[PDB]
Amino acid sequence: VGEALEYVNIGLSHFLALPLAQRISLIIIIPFIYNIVWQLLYSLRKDRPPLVFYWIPWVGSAVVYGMKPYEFFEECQKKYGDIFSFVLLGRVMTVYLGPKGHEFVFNAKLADVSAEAAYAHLTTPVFGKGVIYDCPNSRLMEQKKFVKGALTKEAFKSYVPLIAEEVYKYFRDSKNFRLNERTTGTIDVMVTQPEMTIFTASRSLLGKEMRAKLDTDFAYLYSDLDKGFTPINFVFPNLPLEHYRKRDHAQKAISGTYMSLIKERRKNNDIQDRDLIDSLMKNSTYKDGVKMTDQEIANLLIGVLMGGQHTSAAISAWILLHLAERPDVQQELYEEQMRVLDGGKKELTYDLLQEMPLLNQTIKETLRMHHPLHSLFRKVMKDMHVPNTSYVIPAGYHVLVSPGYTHLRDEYFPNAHQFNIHRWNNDSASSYSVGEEVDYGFGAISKGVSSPYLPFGGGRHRCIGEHFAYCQLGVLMSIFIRTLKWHYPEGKTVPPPDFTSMVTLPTGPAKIIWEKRNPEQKIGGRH
């Protein structure tokens, strides 16, 4: 009876007097044992979705999920159906696949889930404080409104010639091309596209000064800042190491430069309508009267530029890679250019961009096959019951949604792993609210998010960058197509995606060989 409790205390005491060898081994064994025990008991619960079994505690299914998340999702879906959890480096991720999954996560009430609690630890160090995910959602909603205010049809009309100019400059000056000197060459598209993207997006969103500053050793700070933008930071945001310091330094130095330009313009009253900076200078007052600081303005510009950097660089990379084994498509895109721009005797404008459906379909189809963000997350804040199920997702869990996975299902996109731009005949718009709409603070967007095609997400956290992305990728590709033909080195094909990077970029080196359609044509201007 009571002799039992004595031997508990005795057994407790003999424990701590075990040989240290057996002691260190014990400290490994019993959480291992317990984990299996706990998993097995968890399986009983009918108000929890299935949990993918894992051996190593805490680590969970991290390695298999990290390397091939869609193959992992496919497997889990065969066995368990569309709702299932899995452990990932100390967190419980509840996946919900398919259009119902989109509905569950993207249209989750503000009360139930938090994007900032899922994302802030990565982004805040990189972008800086007070903006995006380092603030309440209603602040974010309004920051998105402010940014959108520089992303208008008239802005795109003026961006097009500037982006065009940057792309031509790059063909002229970059070692990777130099078209006034070489008629053919080889490039790594994972070198060329990040540079082309930063050059074109700096010039148009940030302006001529911030573009100019890229022709200096200031450019090294973007590289530094970029290295804090990696998934590692989702779990180790701050570690006393050098690249964590090069990041912190870069955020300060880059934001300082933007603040310098901003304060400079206010000084001379040079606030026009040129770029996103001008725009945020005129329009960054919240509905409660608080103005964003010059520091928050600058931090937001870093965020925006960083966001648009990696998604677009990735996509232009993939477009080049898919087109390299598809001279039929290159030929077809080339004809559309000849028709819409009168054999090239018409200058590219934003309006004419809208009359190039095949081009835009190519972007659309590349966005389907290569969603740059394979997993979007939220942290669960209030217990969530899953509709038409017994399941309840408790606070402290995370939900994971993956439209990119659905993009690659034959059920919704017949022959989903074939690149086919003609599957978007009669549907070349970047996206569009198929029905009723809703405004979270940054404009009216689709109310339903059940579309199997969701390259830009949906709900309150929806992308506001899609028309800029289409504008930028569209001018870029229009010119690539008109200027060059390109193909793979012998025996090379489309590389598989890297799923461990921030975006699903191509696995390197991803090389193509280009050649000038007109070996004799020259790009003017000085260099």
Q: Would you tell me which residues interact with ligand HEM (CB under 6 A)?
A: 115, 140, 144, 147, 304, 307-308, 311-312, 315, 367, 372-373, 376, 455-457, 461, 463-465, 468-469
Token look-up 């992303």 returns 151
Residues 225 and 25: their CA atoms lie apart, in Å, by 42
Pick from 361, 360, 374: nearest CA to 455: 374
Contact call for residue 353 and ligand 1YN (CB under 6 A): no
Token look-up 């009669």 returns 426
Q: What is the pattern of x (binds ligand 1YN, CB under 6 A) and - over residues 129-168?
A: ---x------------------------------------
If the CB atoms of residues 151 and 358 are measured against ligand HEM, the closer one turns out to be 151
- Shortest CB 307 distance to ligand 1YN, Å: 3
Residues 297 and 291: their CA atoms lie apart, in Å, by 10
Residues 26 and 7: their CA atoms lie apart, in Å, by 20
- The amino acid at 196: M
The listed partner (ligand 1YN, ligand HEM, none) that binds 225, CB under 5 to 8 Å by sort, is: none
If the CB atoms of residues 185 and 226 are measured against ligand HEM, the closer one turns out to be 226
The listed partner (ligand HEM, ligand 1YN, none) that binds 144, CB under 5 to 8 Å by sort, is: ligand HEM
Helices and strands in the chain: count of H runs, count of E runs: 19, 12
The listed partner (ligand HEM, ligand 1YN, none) that binds 471, CB under 5 to 8 Å by sort, is: none
* Tokens (6 digits) for 254: 């880059």
Pick from 407, 434, 435: nearest CA to 423: 407
- Shortest CB 123 distance to ligand 1YN, Å: 6
Q: What is the pattern of x (binds ligand 1YN, CB under 6 A) and - over residues 304-343?
A: x-xx---x--------------------------------
Pick from 369, 366, 309: nearest CA to 502: 309
- Shortest CB 302 distance to ligand HEM, Å: 12
* Pair 364, 428: CB distance under 8 Å: yes
* Pair 461, 501: CB distance under 8 Å: no
The listed partner (ligand 1YN, ligand HEM, none) that binds 315, CB under 5 to 8 Å by sort, is: ligand HEM
Contact call for residue 463 and ligand 1YN (CB under 6 A): yes
Bridge partner list, 244: none
Q: What is the 3-state secondary structure (H, E, C) of 48-69?
A: CCCECCCCCCCCECHHHHHHCH
- Shortest CB 525 distance to ligand 1YN, Å: 32
Residues 417 and 408: their CA atoms lie apart, in Å, by 6
The listed partner (ligand 1YN, ligand HEM, none) that binds 312, CB under 5 to 8 Å by sort, is: ligand HEM
* Pair 258, 296: CB distance under 8 Å: no
Contact call for residue 62 and ligand 1YN (CB under 6 A): yes
Residues 516 and 185: their CA atoms lie apart, in Å, by 9
* Pair 430, 151: CB distance under 8 Å: no
| φ, ψ at 503 (rounded to 5°) | -115, 155
Binding residues for heme b: 119, 133, 144, 378, 461, 463
Binding residues: 119, 133, 144, 378, 461, 463
Q: Binding ligand 1YN by CB under 6 A: which of 425, 500, 518, 521?
A: 500
| φ, ψ at 95 (rounded to 5°) | -75, 140
Give the count of residues interacting with ligand 1YN (CB under 6 A).
Answer: 21
- Shortest CB 230 distance to ligand 1YN, Å: 9
- Shortest CB 352 distance to ligand HEM, Å: 21
| φ, ψ at 193 (rounded to 5°) | -80, -40
Binding residues for heme: 463
* Tokens (6 digits) for 318: 């993939």
Contact call for residue 98 and ligand 1YN (CB under 6 A): no
If the CB atoms of residues 128 and 307 are measured against ligand HEM, the closer one turns out to be 307
* Angle, helix 242-267 to helix 219-226, in steps of 10 degrees: 130
If the CB atoms of residues 280 and 502 are measured against ligand 1YN, the closer one turns out to be 502
The listed partner (ligand 1YN, ligand HEM, none) that binds 502, CB under 5 to 8 Å by sort, is: ligand 1YN
Residues that bind ligand 1YN (CB under 6 A): 62-63, 65-67, 119, 123, 132, 231, 303-304, 306-307, 311, 373, 375-376, 463, 465, 500, 502
